[PDB]
UniProtKB/TrEMBL annotation:
It is an enzyme of class 3 (hydrolase). Its main location: host cell. HAMAP family: ENDOLYSIN_T4. One of its GO terms (cellular component) is host cell cytoplasm. It comes from the Viruses. This is Endolysin. It comes from Enterobacteria phage T4 (Bacteriophage T4). The keyword Membrane does not apply. It is found in: Host cytoplasm. It catalyses: Hydrolysis of (1->4)-beta-linkages between N-acetylmuramic acid and N-acetyl-D-glucosamine residues in a peptidoglycan and between N-acetyl-D-glucosamine residues in chitodextrins. Belongs to the glycosyl hydrolase 24 family. The keyword Hydrolase applies. The active site is at residues 11, 20.
């Protein structure tokens, strides 16, 4: 298990434009295109991201290319953020993947807003951090995924992602 396999489980793979859990147009492995309700606007974002005029449909290779860029962008966002970087640096490799997962789903600014959770994680108070992380819109709207990510922070293992 690793961050790519983890996010592939959590996000799925769909080669045609679809709406995510928030109703936003998305494609591939959880690649958010836009929050606009205009499908035309979403298609324009897709063409710009891929570099060609699509029909709202991409190939698996193209989906995996966006995924590689998006995982890279999540790590980049953590490292340039003054709140997230010290937490990331303090964590082991498995919990680092859990933090990347959160940033992938919600964005750098969203995760940096989890001020009290981040402090508990840096303090390595894993059970307390896990309780605090669940007191969130994030957990309420996507509870099964949030439970997997939180279990990863709590235990430092991949137990939540094995034999699914
Ligand atoms: Cl992009
Ligand atoms: Cl969920
Ligand atoms: Na998804």
């Amino acid at each position: 298990m690793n961050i790519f396999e983890m996010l592939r489980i959590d996000e799925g793979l769909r080669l045609k434009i679809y709406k995510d859990t928030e109703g936003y147009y998305t494609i591939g492995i959880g690649h958010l295109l836009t929050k606009s309700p205009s499908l035309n606007a979403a298609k324009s974002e897709l063409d710009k991201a891929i570099g060609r005029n699509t029909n709202g449909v991409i190939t698996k290779d193209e989906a995996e290319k966006l995924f590689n860029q998006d995982v890279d962008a999540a790590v980049r966002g953590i490292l340039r953020n003054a709140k997230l970087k010290p937490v990331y640096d303090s964590l082991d490799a498995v919990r680092r993947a859990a933090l990347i997962n959160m940033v992938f789903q919600m964005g750098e600014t969203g995760v940096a807003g989890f001020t009290n959770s981040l402090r508990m994680l840096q303090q390595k108070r894993w059970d307390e951090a896990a309780v605090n992380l669940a007191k969130s819109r994030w957990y309420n709207q996507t509870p099964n995924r949030a439970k997997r990510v939180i279990t990863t922070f709590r235990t430092g293992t991949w137990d939540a992602y094995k034999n699914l």
